[PDB]
Write a protein that binds this ligand. Structure first.
Ligand code: NA
Length: 259
């Protein structure tokens, strides 16, 4: 590409991200005083393990559905073959969601916007995956220290998704070229905004890989404890992405096929 084309990619990526945000940042900030009461927190903690897992899986599936739409609107993504579209989404959808989560996290009080209000990690105690929860909260806490702009989150999550190193890509070189153009767009934007200092502060990729592995692993523990709940009450797209073998369900291909 060249300078006009790079800036066009910058604006296109930021537009795609705005149109596929579940919640506007302003909406999330305005809600910061709306925190679960101690009695509402006690009620979450008295919910059964399987109901809290189902509710979190539903919450996560809705966020993932927006990431799929982001991908479809991302320059060049729909040009890739369907095998590679699916490889990239299966690998990076949750990674994007974990990054997007910092917008909904309040570092002042260590709360996250969940089911209409802000609550701390104690809200999730019924899940029985305390390590994963605090790992996710610590990750959001670290990202919040970066003070991402919406444009920065747009460009960075595009790169999280368009990763040419994902195992299973049939057209690796084509993904390499798309990745390179998006890197140019991200780094051009950082250069023009004097934000290149954030490059050193971005999490290593192995950290997002690790969080995703923990989630799958805790799911396997839960699935062993309540296999019928997973089969009957977990969202089909969630099972396709995370549960073994859940990927007999193909939701993604329909989400990609339908306009
Ligand atoms: Na934040």
């Amino acid at each position: 590409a060249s300078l006009t084309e790079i800036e066009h990619l910058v604006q296109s990526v930021c537009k795609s991200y705005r149109e596929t945000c579940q919640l506007r940042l302003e909406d999330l900030l305005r809600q910061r005083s709306n925190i679960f009461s101690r009695e509402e927190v006690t009620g979450y903690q008295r919910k059964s393990m399987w109901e809290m897992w189902e509710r979190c899986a539903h919450h996560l599936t809705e966020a993932i559905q927006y990431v799929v739409e982001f991908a479809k609107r991302l320059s060049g993504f729909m040009e890739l073959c369907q095998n590679d579209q699916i490889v990239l989404l299966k690998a990076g959808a949750m990674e994007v969601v974990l990054v997007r989560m910092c917008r909904a996290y309040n570092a002042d009080n260590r709360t996250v916007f969940f089911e209409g209000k802000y609550g701390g990690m104690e809200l999730f105690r019924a899940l029985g995956c305390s390590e994963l929860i605090s790992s996710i909260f610590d990750f959001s806490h670290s990202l919040s220290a970066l003070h991402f702009s919406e444009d920065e989150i747009a460009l960075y999550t595009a790169l999280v998704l368009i990763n040419a190193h994902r195992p299973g890509l049939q057209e690796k070189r084509k993904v390499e070229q798309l990745q390179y153009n998006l890197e140019l767009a991200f780094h051009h934007h950082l250069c023009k905004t004097h934000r290149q200092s954030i490059l050193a502060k971005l999490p290593p990729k192995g950290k997002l890989r690790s969080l995703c592995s923990q989630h799958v692993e805790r799911l396997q523990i839960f699935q062993h404890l309540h296999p019928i709940v997973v089969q009957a009450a977990f969202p089909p797209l969630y099972k396709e992405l995370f549960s073994g073998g859940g990927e007999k369900h193909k939701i993604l291909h329909r989400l990609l096929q339908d306009s």
